[PDB]
Structures are given as structure tokens and as C-alpha cells.
């Protein structure tokens, strides 16, 4: 592959790619959250390059979960996430979150569609993974 | 260095040829099938094989807590599943064991608790999007 710079620039331009197209008059405060949340998962001492895949990724399966009208339930869990009692509640709602994201990637016709290979090429991979858990149970 | 391919790929054969000795051929067919599923799902290679090291990481330190034995059930049957939905609940139950590994972790909890209290600055500007879309 390349190096990490060519990473992070592909990843960062495909959020700005997201950025742009929100409606204007929101850029500017999402401006912001990308790069408190940036912020933050640096100060967590995770690389960068994780933090901004996870920042990318996250972005883009918010951009698809928007289309459908889920961006008014995500925000208001991410509200409830961040002003949770503990950290076991904050996980709790933040898998919410994600649930929800993966579901709309599931209502997309093209996430489904992809979705389903995922399923179907995964049977070389269930018997390695049978042949194996069936090794650890001998030990 | 300059490939991260090779950091990570590097990354991922360590903990391989750490793994006990039975497991370590079958392992390493397990990466390079799913390193295939990963670009035909329209991955870059970069990024399937970043995410193949990461990944590998969490499976590592929750196999130190007695869980990879869960995981791998998990992950037959949500590859065995029937639907689409139900391969995705399964899948969710996966990451809900990786949050838990990363909280039972020293390190991780102490940065997990650093986000209840770094919460507050996210807060106030989603709030601002909350209260701008309730507008319309």
C-alpha cells in the first residue's frame, strides 16, 4: 500500500465529501464536531490512522442512515450517549447507534446487496472457523 | 514504514506466530480468505488489510479475557445465520464483546471514562444540530 499521510488524505477527503453534502448552514457546526471528535479520539493515544478510519467509516454509514431519515433518531442517541450516568450506559446506546446504522445499511439495496455476498462468500470461512473451534475444544 | 500494509501485515503475523503452534496454519488461511472477502466488498486493500490489524487486536486482548472462545461461536453463527438482519444481530453481540474487553482493560477503561467527562464539548454543538433540525 502507501503510507499513513495517503491514508489519512483519502479518508479526510472522503468526510469533507460528506460535509459538503449536508445542507448549508449545518457545515459549520459539523465542521466543529469532526474536529473535537478528532480531537478527542487523539488524546485517547490512538493512532491516528485508526481514529480517522473509524471517524470515515462512522461519517459514511451516518451519510446512508440520513437518507433514510434516521439522522433525527442517531442524534438524539448521541445526545443520551454523551450525557449518560457511566461509561457501561454510554457503550449501551452507543451499540444503539450502531445497530441502527448497520439496519440502514441493510435497507439500502446496494448495502443489502453487498451484504449478501458477505454471507455467501463466508462459507470458506465457516468451516476454518468450525475446524478450528473444533481443535480448541480437544485442548 | 512508508507501507502501512506492511506494518499491519507485519502487525497481524505476530500475533500469529505467537498463537499456539495447532492453530497457526489455519489461522493464516483464515487471513488471506478474509482479506479476499474484504476487496470484493469494494474495500481498498489499504484499508482491508488496516482493518484486518485492528480487528486482530481486539480479538487478542479479549482472548486474554476468556472470550474468544464466544467470538468464534459468534462468528459461525452469524455466517451460518438465515437473514441479512439476524448475521448483523450476531455481529452487533461481537462488537458488544470488544467494548467489553476494552472496559475490563486497565489502560482502556481509564480512556473509556475519559470520554464521560470529554463528552460535554460534543454536547453542546450536536445539541445545536438537534435544535436546528427541530426547526424544520
Known amino acids: ?6 491514508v489519512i488524505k483519502q479518508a479526510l477527503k472522503r468526510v469533507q465529501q460528506y460535509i459538503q453534502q449536508a445542507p448549508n448552514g449545518y457545515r459549520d457546526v459539523i465542521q466543529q464536531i469532526l474536529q473535537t471528535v478528532l480531537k478527542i479520539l487523539k488524546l485517547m493515544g490512538m493512532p491516528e490512522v485508526e481514529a480517522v478510519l473509524i471517524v470515515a467509516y462512522v461519517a459514511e454509514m451516518l451519510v446512508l442512515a440520513a437518507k433514510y431519515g434516521y439522522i433525527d433518531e442517531l442524534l438524539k442517541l448521541a445526545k443520551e450517549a454523551l450525557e449518560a450516568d457511566d461509561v457501561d450506559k454510554m457503550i449501551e446506546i452507543f451499540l444503539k447507534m450502531l445497530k441502527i446504522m448497520f439496519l440502514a445499511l441493510a435497507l ?7 451484504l449478501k455476498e458477505l454471507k455467501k462468500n463466508g462459507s470458506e470461512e465457516v468451516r476454518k472457523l468450525i475446524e478450528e473451534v473444533i481443535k480448541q475444544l480437544k485442548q
Open 1 to 6: 500500500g502507501r503510507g499513513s499521510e495517503d
Open 108 to 114: 439500502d439495496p446496494e448495502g443489502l446487496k453487498k
